[PDB]
Every structure is written in structure tokens, then in C-alpha cells.
């Protein structure tokens, strides 16, 4: 069984969903954590300096 | 390289955990104020998943239903006693001090009141040898002479299920089923059969530990494999 096309047919699990806090489809319904804004993980909003060029 | 199997164990992930949610109970002796005024009736005999040996369900006078580490010879209906004044008979528990020298005992406590630590496995038994006002001497299953507080509680008789080890598993499948009831990763891939990156013995054209197996006690985890601090090896001499 190839890792490619044939293995793609087994994918019918819902993980990432519309996030209550930020509105992005990043709320992982299994972990109950938003990979985009951090909801469910932290009160503070998920943010990182590497999201932009260092001097900008 | 990569951490060896022995190091993966320590993390306690599911693969290495025992099926505790399927275990019955921890056959620890009952706690009595004093007097020995405690007796119960063997209500049933059950299989203990964690030890592959039988356990006896007992109902005590004061209304407490608990499983007990049963010796060989205990059956339904029988009456058991637990306390200083307990009768000297198989299945009864009392402090070593009350036990007569030369009597086979099991589920011996290490420290008075801990519930029992020694000789709990199938068909084994400790042998109470010397008595005293300060120290009770017991010969444990390994043949070691152990010095215990005469206050350490114990059960008369040998543990039920003796001889379990006399029959060969015969097939992998049987080993399999037993291993599924323990905190153990099985089957076992030999270190010499792995890649160098995975074990000190891995690598090489033909399989062989390109090094002596007797490893020092001071060796760090990841390197402490093979024959740990062996005082000797082989069968010779």
C-alpha cells in the first residue's frame, strides 16, 4: 500500500475547525487547542517574532 | 546515536506500562488495632491477573470484603485469622514474633505494617529460622538470610500456584498472552541484531558485540548494557 494516493482515501477525520476565539479554521477539535491563536492553550494571544523578518 | 530501548522504558509511555486498569487489588495485610479479634470467611477463589496465581476473596467479621494473598490449601468456607493471637494455621496472618521457628511463611513485611513485600510469587515461601526479642531471622526464596523486626507481619504457608514454572510455554503465542498482562515490551530484538546507531552492540558485517559485554557499574544509561557489573561469567571454574 503506497504512502501516496491510496493512503489519501483513508482521510475522513475532522481535526482543525473554526475557532471560537479567532475565527480561523485552526481549532483542533481533538486537542481543543487553536494552532493559530492559542485558544485553549493560553489566555494571551499566540504570537511570535519569527512571524516576520527580524528587522521588521 | 538514538536512545536505546532501556531508555525508552523510563518514560512510562503506554507501550511500557502494565495494564493496571485491569488489575484487581494489592493483597496487603489488614490493619488491626490490637487483640487479633479479626477473623473472616473465604468467600471465593479468584485469578490474579498481575501474578498468574490465585487470590482468595475474604469477608471479615467487621464487614470488610477484601482480596488476600492466598497460600496453597485455602478454600471456600475456610476461616482465616489476622492478629497477634491468631491461631498458628495455614492462611493466617500474625507478627513473626508469634510464629514458631521452622515455619514456612509468605507475604512477609519489610517494615512492620507495610502490608507485605517478600515472598509473594507463585509457590514460593520464606523460612522463619531464628527468633528473638530484637530480631527475627528469615531465609528468603533467593536463599538470603534476612534480618527483620519481629513485629513484621506474615502469612503461614507457601504461596498458591507452585510449579507454574515447570511447564514450558512451548509457543510464542503463549508467551505473548502472558506478556500482555505485564508491564513489559515483548518480543526481544537482540542488540547485536540492530544498527550501530541503536545499541552499543549494533553494526558490523557479521553480528557480534565488537566489545566486551561485562560493563562497569559506573556506566551511564545508554551504555550500561550486556552483563552489568558481572562478578564473573560463563559456567566454568
Amino acid at each position: 500500500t503506497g504512502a501516496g494516493t491510496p493512503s489519501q482515501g483513508k482521510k475522513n477525520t475532522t481535526t482543525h475547525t473554526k475557532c471560537r476565539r479567532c475565527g480561523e479554521k485552526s481549532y483542533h477539535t481533538k486537542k481543543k487547542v487553536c494552532s493559530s491563536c492559542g485558544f485553549g492553550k493560553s489566555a494571551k494571544r499566540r504570537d511570535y517574532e519569527w512571524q516576520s523578518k527580524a528587522g521588521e | 546515536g538514538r536512545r536505546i530501548q532501556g531508555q525508552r522504558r523510563g518514560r512510562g509511555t503506554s507501550t511500557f506500562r502494565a495494564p493496571s486498569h485491569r488489575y484487581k487489588a494489592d493483597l496487603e495485610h489488614r490493619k488491626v488495632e490490637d487483640g487479633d479479634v479479626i477473623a473472616g470467611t473465604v468467600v471465593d477463589i479468584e485469578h490474579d491477573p498481575a501474578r498468574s496465581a490465585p487470590v482468595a476473596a475474604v469477608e471479615f467479621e467487621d464487614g470488610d470484603r477484601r482480596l488476600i494473598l492466598a497460600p496453597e490449601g485455602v478454600g471456600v468456607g475456610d476461616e482465616l485469622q489476622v492478629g497477634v493471637s491468631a491461631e498458628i494455621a495455614p492462611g493466617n496472618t500474625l507478627p513473626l514474633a508469634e510464629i514458631p521457628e521452622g515455619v514456612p511463611v509468605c507475604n512477609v513485611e519489610s517494615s512492620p505494617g507495610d502490608g507485605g513485600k517478600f515472598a509473594r510469587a507463585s509457590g514460593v515461601n520464606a523460612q522463619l529460622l531464628t527468633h528473638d526479642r530484637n530480631v527475627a531471622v528469615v531465609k528468603l526464596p533467593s536463599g538470603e538470610m534476612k534480618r527483620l523486626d519481629p513485629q513484621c507481619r506474615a502469612t503461614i504457608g507457601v504461596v498458591a500456584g507452585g510449579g507454574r514454572t515447570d511447564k514450558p510455554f512451548v509457543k510464542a503465542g503463549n508467551k505473548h498472552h502472558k506478556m500482555k498482562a505485564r508491564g513489559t515490551k515483548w518480543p526481544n530484538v537482540r542488540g547485536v541484531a540492530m544498527n550501530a546507531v541503536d545499541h552499543p552492540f549494533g553494526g558490523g558485517g557479521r553480528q557480534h558485540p565488537g566489545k566486551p559485554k561485562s560493563i562497569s557499574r559506573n556506566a551511564p544509561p545508554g551504555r550500561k548494557v550486556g552483563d552489568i557489573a558481572s562478578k564473573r561469567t560463563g559456567r566454568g571454574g
Binding site: - | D44, I45, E46, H47, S52, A53, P54, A56, A70, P71, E72, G73, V74, G75, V76, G77, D78, P90, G102, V103, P104, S122, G123, N125, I156, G157, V158, A160, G161, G162, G163, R164, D166, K167, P168, V170, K171
Partner: protein, 73 residues
């Protein structure tokens, strides 16, 4: 006996299984009454079909050598 093992495993392994189980399945004298109606119920668990006495014993024998020692001493 080990006939269910066919030509597999080899002598020893299946010779002991036959002997162990041969003795295991024999009629055993019940400690309670005196009849030879004791059958194994599971690992180390024995019962008499006559008086219904359910008790603990060896894994494959109702009584073990070490077990018959506690009596003495």
C-alpha cells in the same frame, strides 16, 4: 495429550506438557470430603464436583511438594 501439537515443538516440550497435564487431569482426592472428584478450574484453582469445595493448590497439581511441608512443621 500433546497430540494436538502434531509434529511440532519436539519431544521434551510436548513430553512434559503430556505428563504435567496427564497428572493435572487425574482424579484428585478432595481435601474436604474424600472423593476423587477434584478438577482444575483455572491456574492454581481447584474444585470438587462432589461437595463443591473450591480451593487453592499448585498451578497444575492440587498439591505441591512445598505445600505438603507446611502441614508437618
Amino acid at each position: 495429550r500433546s497430540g494436538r501439537f502434531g509434529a511440532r515443538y519436539g519431544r521434551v516440550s510436548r513430553r512434559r506438557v503430556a505428563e504435567i497435564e496427564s497428572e493435572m487431569n487425574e482424579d484428585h482426592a478432595c481435601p474436604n470430603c474424600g472423593e476423587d472428584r477434584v478438577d482444575r478450574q483455572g491456574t492454581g484453582i481447584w474444585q470438587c464436583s462432589y461437595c463443591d469445595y473450591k480451593f487453592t493448590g499448585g498451578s497444575y497439581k492440587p498439591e505441591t511438594p512445598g505445600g505438603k511441608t507446611v502441614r508437618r512443621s
